[PDB]
Amino acid sequence: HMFDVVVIGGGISGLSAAKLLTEYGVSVLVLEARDRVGGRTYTIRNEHVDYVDVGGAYVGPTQNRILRLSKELGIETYKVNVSERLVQYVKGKTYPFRAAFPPVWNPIAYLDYNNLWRTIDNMGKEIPTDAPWEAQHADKWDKMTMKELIDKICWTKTARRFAYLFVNINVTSEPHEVSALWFLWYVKQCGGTTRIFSVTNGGQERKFVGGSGQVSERIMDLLGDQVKLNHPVTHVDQSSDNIIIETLNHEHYECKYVINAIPPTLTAKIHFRPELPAERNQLIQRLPMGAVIKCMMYYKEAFWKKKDYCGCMIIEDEDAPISITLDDTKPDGSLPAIMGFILARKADRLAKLHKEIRKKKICELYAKVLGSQEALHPVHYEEKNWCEEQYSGGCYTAYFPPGIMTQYGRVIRQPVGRIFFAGTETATKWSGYMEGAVEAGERAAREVLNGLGKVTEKDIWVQEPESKDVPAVEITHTFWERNLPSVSGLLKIIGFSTSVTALGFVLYKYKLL
Ligand SMILES: Cc1cc2nc3c(=O)[nH]c(=O)nc-3n(C[C@H](O)[C@H](O)[C@H](O)COP(=O)(O)OP(=O)(O)OC[C@H]3O[C@@H](n4cnc5c(N)ncnc54)[C@H](O)[C@@H]3O)c2cc1C
Ligand SMILES: COc1ccc2c(c1)[nH]c1c(C)nccc12
Ligand SMILES: CCCCCCCCCCP(C)(C)=O
Ligand SMILES: CCCCCCCCCCP(C)(C)=O
Numbered sequence: 251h252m253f254d255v256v257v258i259g260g261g262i263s264g265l266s267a268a269k270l271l272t273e274y275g276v277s278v279l280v281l282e283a284r285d286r287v288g289g290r291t292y293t294i295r296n297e298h299v300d301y302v303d304v305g306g307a308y309v310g311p312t313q314n315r316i317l318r319l320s321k322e323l324g325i326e327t328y329k330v331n332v333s334e335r336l337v338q339y340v341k342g343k344t345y346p347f348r349a350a351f352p353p354v355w356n357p358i359a360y361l362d363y364n365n366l367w368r369t370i371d372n373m374g375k376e377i378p379t380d381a382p383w384e385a386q387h388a389d390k391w392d393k394m395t396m397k398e399l400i401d402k403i404c405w406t407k408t409a410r411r412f413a414y415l416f417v418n419i420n421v422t423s424e425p426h427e428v429s430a431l432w433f434l435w436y437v438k439q440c441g442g443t444t445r446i447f448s449v450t451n452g453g454q455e456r457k458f459v460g461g462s463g464q465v466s467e468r469i470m471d472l473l474g475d476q477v478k479l480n481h482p483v484t485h486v487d488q489s490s491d492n493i494i495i496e497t498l499n500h501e502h503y504e505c506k507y508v509i510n511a512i513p514p515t516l517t518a519k520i521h522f523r524p525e526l527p528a529e530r531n532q533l534i535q536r537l538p539m540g541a542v543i544k545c546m547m548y549y550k551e552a553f554w555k556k557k558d559y560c561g562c563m564i565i566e567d568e569d570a571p572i573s574i575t576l577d578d579t580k581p582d583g584s585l586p587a588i589m590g591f592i593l594a595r596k597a598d599r600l601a602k603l604h605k606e607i608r609k610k611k612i613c614e615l616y617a618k619v620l621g622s623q624e625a626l627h628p629v630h631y632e633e634k635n636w637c638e639e640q641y642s643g644g645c646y647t648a649y650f651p652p653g654i655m656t657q658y659g660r661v662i663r664q665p666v667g668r669i670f671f672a673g674t675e676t677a678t679k680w681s682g683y684m685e686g687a688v689e690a691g692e693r694a695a696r697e698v699l700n701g702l703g704k705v706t707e708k709d710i711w712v713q714e715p716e717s718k719d720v721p722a723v724e725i726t727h728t729f730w731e732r733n734l735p736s737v738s739g740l741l742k743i744i745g746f747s748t749s750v751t752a753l754g755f756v757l758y759k760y761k762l763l
Contacts, residue, residue, distance in 0.1 A: 311451055
């Protein structure tokens, strides 16, 4: 029962740390709470679905780590379907479109919406990726909620409603819940607004053939009996050179280094000895998990396609069960499906229904949105409620409430003696994602390897070579995106246009042109 390293948690972060340590000849024990690995990724297998991700599923350009780890484990990606039209459903109306963002035809709302995404990205620029609390405006921004920033930068109700939604979709909580500072950073560290929100060339570009659960399943395969299921860790005691780990059934393991590869809320439940610094205890108990119910509606035929819909719906409607959807049809066209998310407060309220009613209401929304009755005839329904997962807390990730970042934030990933911290929440690139889980996992392993004297201080943070199979097409903005003014910008200019048109009339009246 003695090891160099014990990794607490066998999600992608944990297994990445363990896989890397193992590569260096270091003995590692992964202790995993559930009867399975993979954590917030979970690929369910049955006859009705073949396979399906009920947890994390999508990968895209710039996520080079999860790509490189996926590949080398023999896992291949395929493209999310966007061949047909995306649709936006607002105010009872279905609006097909083709871009990453629903087109805005009101010229004023257009400016508003343009300036919103530009400002988010621009404000992100300011924020240090590794150290968001060091941002020039950090205290100011960290005190505001994302609702307050949205309402401050958007004049139109259209753009605020979309923004709120955008917040829901990306961090699975309500704008009023999350720090504006943390959110600007969150978006910056995923590559900006276009990158985070897009399918083509964005974070939703791709899925894994056979599911993302296979990432963890196969690292566990490599690890053999150095991974232990059903071992929830409850105590971590680093008083002596041999750190003692205790699991829920009172088994004990000893090691030299611990990697904590679970989200903060669950890190909050571990009895640490000595106690973590008060600062750190506050931070980990103050980062709540977002909320999602992921829902899979199966049909005989991908009827959305024949109406020229790809099956991606941005549903901006407060009565609506679902917020957003993608086609989830298998790469060969078999088992046509719509992956739907119920997010943020809507998840919390829909969780209160029976599954059949939740299914009923979703079919009814699909029927409406897609303008077909075939939606009311599913051959199968899968759902997974992530809030109700004791070993996850929710999905996708933790969110930072206002103030937390500036007050406790600076230690999310700081070692505590010989305890190192991983988990996607400690990542600096695609934190919140399977990508971030790998980054954090490997950097923690490197922090440990560096303790063991096997890796240099410079080598703790390694750059991922860009993926050759899924290269990052650079994100462009049109001349007009760059240069069109905000609503209030329009006004400052119009009041110039007007001033001088006016003096162009006093100069024309007095022949002084
Ligand atoms: C519905 C849903 C949709 C998502 N969408 C995507 C997506 O499309 N693409 C993407 O990249 N990401 C997505 N995410 C987020 C992504 O799944 C996570 O960011 C990533 O899986 C986090 O991995 P981790 O290893 O850091 O954490 P986890 O996967 O949470 O792993 C933690 C591990 O610790 C175990 N554990 C917990 N407590 C203990 C304990 N005390 N002792 C021992 N073990 C413990 C848990 O069982 C788990 O296996 C989604 C997540 C969900 C749930
Ligand atoms: C733009 O349409 C979508 C569809 C699914 C997701 C999306 C946007 N953003 C997501 C995120 C951030 N995670 C999981 C799924 C999606
Ligand atoms: C005085 C107002 C000038 C603003 C003009 C905005 C043009 C709206 C069309 C944008 P689309 C992305 C092609 O739908
Ligand atoms: C002041 C006159 C308005 C000029 C037209 C603005 C719309 C430009 C089309 C949109 P994009 C190509 C994506 O930036």
